[PDB]
Write a protein that binds this ligand. Sequence first.
Ligand SMILES: NC(=O)CN(CC(=O)O)CC(=O)O
Ligand SMILES: NC(=O)CN(CC(=O)O)CC(=O)O
Ligand SMILES: NC(=O)CN(CC(=O)O)CC(=O)O
Length: 492
Amino acid sequence: AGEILIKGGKVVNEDCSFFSDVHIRGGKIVEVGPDLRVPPGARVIDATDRLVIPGGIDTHTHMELAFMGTRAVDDFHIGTKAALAGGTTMILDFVMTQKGQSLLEAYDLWRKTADPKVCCDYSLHVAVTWWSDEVKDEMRTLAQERGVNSFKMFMAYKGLFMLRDDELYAVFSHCKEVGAIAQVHAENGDLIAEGAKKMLSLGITGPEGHELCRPEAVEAEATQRAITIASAVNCPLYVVHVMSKSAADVVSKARKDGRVVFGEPIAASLGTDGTNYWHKDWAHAAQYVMGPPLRPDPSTPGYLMDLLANDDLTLTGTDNCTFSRCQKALGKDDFTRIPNGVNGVEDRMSVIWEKGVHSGKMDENRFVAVTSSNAAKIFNFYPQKGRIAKDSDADVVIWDPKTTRKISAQTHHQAVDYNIFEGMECHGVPVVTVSRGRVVYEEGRLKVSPGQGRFIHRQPFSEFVYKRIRQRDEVGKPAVVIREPYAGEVVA
Ligand SMILES: NC(=O)CN(CC(=O)O)CC(=O)O
Ligand SMILES: NC(=O)CN(CC(=O)O)CC(=O)O
Ligand SMILES: NC(=O)CN(CC(=O)O)CC(=O)O
């Protein structure tokens, strides 16, 4: 039948927590209430002394993304298994279209790669790495027909993905017309390009040059710039992988000023820092290289977690894009050749619980909001996911917040052979993971097959995102002053 009763636990949604059992049938939660009856044949999962939470939604992944022909080692199959083992039940991955290439072709290639491999549900964001009439039409098709309401634009990567301010204005205006949210990689690509050339010329070829060539002012600048453009066109904006206190403070100030913008720190920037780039062991230092870089101010992850607790920042992903030690070593002599990307998909939930809830910065309900609910609201499938409620999808984690686990590359399920959180002791253990109403992870073992997950098709004009946008189109139009024509003389 696929019938499950989760009994004895405490349900934790983003608004409040309460003791209740949860009845799962046919992929769905069909009842939430105290002391529910066990129908003959249903499996009982005993959640006594545990929390029963919506499974995590990782807003930010890059499973098996190609770097110069060699692919990230966590692929859609191993990467989603690792997600489940860490309490995350959905991933949103970026379709990376090359400059001049069809976005629809790249979307089809992502679906054909991911559909037969994912072990949990997923969806896609689509990168807009160039601009033309064709891109414009393909974005409308993606939004209206292909289930994608999120487009990602780059202010970094000069010559490769970067768009200039005039093209960002056009692309953002078009996001707004099709009801999508505009995501941005906010670092100044002209400064990165110059900074890297400068560090190499000085013989700083190691990972410390990767951070030194683009310190946090470069990320803060472009973040304010994207906000200013999106505000000029009334387009909702999403700043992916916020890595620094000063970029987080730009998003914080803009939201207090009423800008429709959301900021997304990732597990890496919440759980570790960039002092690792200065480690004497080259291999250790290269493990942390990603764009934008982790920051060498050690107060950074605690401050980003304070701003996530306070809703200056709103939700979390991992930017999981993993490369083995032998793949990182492509840039042993030149940091610009190190394939960028770190791990996180598996450890996100425990890292945030340990650094955010156990530390007393946020409570269990805000934890659910920043790890599933807000993702579901922004990308338009709430309360289908991100809530324990009748009629929601049965993507459910039984969570032990009292026991600790030590995070280690020796025990993790990711394909990558190191872990940037190596050694960390976290309160908060996913003990059972249910995905699409099936037990896919329990007693430390995965039970799931490649292709069991499904692509989630979303509609455009997410209400959480657009209700203010649409009201501002109605009352915020600029008005002419009514005047008599100017009568006087004009110079020759
Ligand atoms: N890493 C950096 O900071 C500079 N590089 C980034 C890298 O590719 O590791 C940018 C460039 O190629 O100009
Ligand atoms: N050295 C790199 O990984 C260059 N990367 C930079 C990044 O991933 O941020 C661009 C790409 O992968 O196409
Ligand atoms: N860690 C990285 O920089 C990987 N890359 C991967 C890509 O987006 O091409 C960019 C990002 O993750 O920010």
